[PDB]
Amino acid sequence: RANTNIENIGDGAEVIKRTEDVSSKKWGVTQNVQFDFVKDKKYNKDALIVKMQGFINSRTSFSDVKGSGYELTKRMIWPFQYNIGLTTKDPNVSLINYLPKNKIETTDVGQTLGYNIGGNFQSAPSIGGNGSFNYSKTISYTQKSYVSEVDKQNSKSVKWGVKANEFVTPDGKKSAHDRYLFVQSPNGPTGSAREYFAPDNQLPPLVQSGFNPSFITTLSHEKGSSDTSEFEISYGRNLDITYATLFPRTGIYAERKHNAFVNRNFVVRYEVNWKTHEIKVKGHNKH
Ligand SMILES: [Cl-]
């Protein structure tokens, strides 16, 4: 037990903490996942609090459009939504909580999942408001210009979508669905495609760089049902394309292809062993 990260959380209860880090250079994703087993002699179920962190590259790019008639057209590919989800199919496991639980539109998201001996979970959309829990886990992330929604939630799966919402632009606030979002008339000489789009200082981090997720869901398992369960964690993005064409007579013309690339996700299959309190990577879609 000395080589295992174990926290005593009160009489007859402790948390066994495991981690896995799994990255894909192909998908531009890192999953830094924490898996905390709640061991409580006064709770008839096993529980695994799964905290999903890491990185999802924006995969934003600016390029020329090849072909006849497209000589004056440039393309910006950028992430309209980041996808984070966890799914199970084994009858022996279900999801009993998830954070965030509701739509949240604030630039900063900071929430807490608390546990009290006897199988009692509670959540709050804030950090620091409570010192009554036997154990707690928090989530924290920034999503400037984006909003978080629970796209799917049920006893077997949860999916969050962190979606483009409203942006600060030189001309004022613009909707994520405005076809002229990020478009501009070019001025300089070098690397022309980049110049048809808003400079980096106008692109918020979720467009320019990527997203650092922080989400939780708790897996529930009846003590005495089968030893292991598999589940998949998916991180990725949906990309839009904004096309900008410079017309000699009328200026810059923009068109958007919304949902241009959907579900560009890195999926990792894990196994939890409820008896040995271990986690293993079983498979993934790196190739
Ligand atoms: Cl991609």
From Swiss-Prot:
Pfam families for this protein: Leukocidin
Predominant cellular place of this UniProt entry's protein: secreted
Compartmental location: Secreted
Cellular component, GO annotation: extracellular region
Key words of the record: Cytolysis, Hemolysis, Secreted, Signal, Toxin, Virulence
Any one biological process term the GO annotation gives: cytolysis in another organism
TM region positions: none
One of the record's GO molecular function terms: toxin activity
Subunit comment: Toxicity requires sequential binding and synergistic association of a class S and a class F component which form heterooligomeric complexes. LukEv (class S) associates with LukDv (class F).
The protein's role, per its UniProt record: Part of a bi-component leucotoxin that acts by forming pores in the membrane of the target cells. The activity of LukEv-LukDv to rabbit leukocytes is similar to that of the Panton-Valentine leucocidin (PVL). LukEv-LukDv is hemolytic to rabbit red blood cells although the activity is only 8% of gamma-hemolysin.
Family, as annotated: Belongs to the aerolysin family.
Classification via NCBIfam families: hlyII
Name under which the protein is recorded: Leucotoxin LukEv
